Design a protein around this motif. Structure first.
Motif, PDB file in Angstrom:
ATOM      1  N   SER A  31      -1.483  12.707  98.106  1.00 35.17           N
ATOM      2  CA  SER A  31      -2.838  13.212  97.921  1.00 35.17           C
ATOM      3  C   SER A  31      -3.371  12.849  96.540  1.00 35.17           C
ATOM      4  O   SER A  31      -4.429  12.232  96.410  1.00 35.17           O
ATOM      5  CB  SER A  31      -2.870  14.731  98.111  1.00 35.17           C
ATOM      6  N   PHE A  32      -2.630  13.236  95.505  1.00 39.42           N
ATOM      7  CA  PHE A  32      -3.026  12.952  94.132  1.00 39.42           C
ATOM      8  C   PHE A  32      -3.327  11.468  93.947  1.00 39.42           C
ATOM      9  O   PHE A  32      -4.457  11.086  93.635  1.00 39.42           O
ATOM     10  CB  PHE A  32      -1.924  13.385  93.161  1.00 39.42           C
ATOM     11  N   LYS A  34      -4.287   9.344  95.594  1.00 41.33           N
ATOM     12  CA  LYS A  34      -5.581   9.007  96.176  1.00 41.33           C
ATOM     13  C   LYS A  34      -6.716   9.656  95.392  1.00 41.33           C
ATOM     14  O   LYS A  34      -7.643   8.979  94.949  1.00 41.33           O
ATOM     15  CB  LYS A  34      -5.635   9.452  97.639  1.00 41.33           C
ATOM     16  N   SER A  35      -6.636  10.971  95.226  1.00 42.07           N
ATOM     17  CA  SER A  35      -7.659  11.715  94.498  1.00 42.07           C
ATOM     18  C   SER A  35      -7.026  12.755  93.579  1.00 42.07           C
ATOM     19  O   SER A  35      -6.481  13.757  94.040  1.00 42.07           O
ATOM     20  CB  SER A  35      -8.618  12.397  95.477  1.00 42.07           C
ATOM     21  N   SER A  36      -7.102  12.507  92.275  1.00 41.52           N
ATOM     22  CA  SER A  36      -6.533  13.420  91.290  1.00 41.52           C
ATOM     23  C   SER A  36      -6.925  14.862  91.595  1.00 41.52           C
ATOM     24  O   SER A  36      -6.082  15.760  91.595  1.00 41.52           O
ATOM     25  CB  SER A  36      -6.998  13.040  89.884  1.00 41.52           C
ATOM     26  N   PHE A  37      -8.210  15.077  91.856  1.00 42.67           N
ATOM     27  CA  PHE A  37      -8.715  16.410  92.163  1.00 42.67           C
ATOM     28  C   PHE A  37      -8.856  16.606  93.670  1.00 42.67           C
ATOM     29  O   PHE A  37      -9.801  16.131  94.297  1.00 42.67           O
ATOM     30  CB  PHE A  37     -10.065  16.636  91.479  1.00 42.67           C
ATOM     31  N   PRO A  38      -7.889  17.321  94.265  1.00 45.76           N
ATOM     32  CA  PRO A  38      -7.882  17.598  95.705  1.00 45.76           C
ATOM     33  C   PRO A  38      -8.986  18.563  96.116  1.00 45.76           C
ATOM     34  O   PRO A  38      -9.497  19.327  95.295  1.00 45.76           O
ATOM     35  CB  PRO A  38      -6.506  18.226  95.938  1.00 45.76           C
ATOM     36  N   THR A  39      -9.355  18.527  97.393  1.00 51.41           N
ATOM     37  CA  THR A  39     -10.399  19.397  97.914  1.00 51.41           C
ATOM     38  C   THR A  39      -9.804  20.604  98.630  1.00 51.41           C
ATOM     39  O   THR A  39      -8.652  20.573  99.062  1.00 51.41           O
ATOM     40  CB  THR A  39     -11.327  18.645  98.884  1.00 51.41           C
ATOM     41  N   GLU A  42      -7.769  19.717 101.409  1.00 51.79           N
ATOM     42  CA  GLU A  42      -6.568  19.017 100.972  1.00 51.79           C
ATOM     43  C   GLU A  42      -5.513  20.003 100.478  1.00 51.79           C
ATOM     44  O   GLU A  42      -4.466  20.176 101.105  1.00 51.79           O
ATOM     45  CB  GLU A  42      -6.907  18.018  99.862  1.00 51.79           C
ATOM     46  N   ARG A  65      -1.929  14.560  85.646  1.00 51.84           N
ATOM     47  CA  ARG A  65      -3.041  13.890  84.982  1.00 51.84           C
ATOM     48  C   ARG A  65      -2.630  13.398  83.596  1.00 51.84           C
ATOM     49  O   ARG A  65      -2.925  12.267  83.214  1.00 51.84           O
ATOM     50  CB  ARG A  65      -4.238  14.834  84.866  1.00 51.84           C
ATOM     51  N   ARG A  68      -1.320  10.114  83.644  1.00 48.75           N
ATOM     52  CA  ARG A  68      -2.316   9.087  83.926  1.00 48.75           C
ATOM     53  C   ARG A  68      -3.185   8.821  82.699  1.00 48.75           C
ATOM     54  O   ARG A  68      -3.546   7.678  82.417  1.00 48.75           O
ATOM     55  CB  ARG A  68      -3.195   9.508  85.104  1.00 48.75           C
TER      56      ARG A  68
END
Length: 89
Positions: A31-32, A34-39, A42, A65, A68
């Motif tokens: 998940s991360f 793909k998108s650091s900030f999950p919904t 998610e 983070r 990164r």
């Protein structure tokens, strides 16, 4: 799946907190990465899947983070706490 979502509650677990299991981390990374900030959706699947709580994961992602960022110029919040108990800590 389970009958009820994973939520915290007033109780004493006979088992001590264990390090993030390969499986769990693997589920989060997917998940991360793909998108650091999950919904909401998610994360919801992250906690249940990895069998963790909002706070629990919050830490994983929060740090994820930092790796990164690579010590790059970025605004961040301030925080500080003090926990004690066990020896050599």
């Amino acid at each position: 799946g389970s009958s009820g979502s994973s939520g915290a509650y007033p109780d004493f677990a006979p088992q001590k907190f264990k390090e993030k299991t390969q499986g769990q981390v693997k589920i989060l990374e997917d998940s991360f990465l793909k998108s650091s900030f999950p919904t909401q959706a998610e994360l919801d699947r992250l906690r249940v899947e990895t069998k963790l709580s909002r706070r629990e994961i919050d830490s994983w992602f929060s740090e994820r983070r930092k790796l990164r960022d690579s010590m790059e110029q970025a605004v961040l919040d301030s925080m500080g706490s003090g926990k004690s108990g066990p020896s050599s800590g």
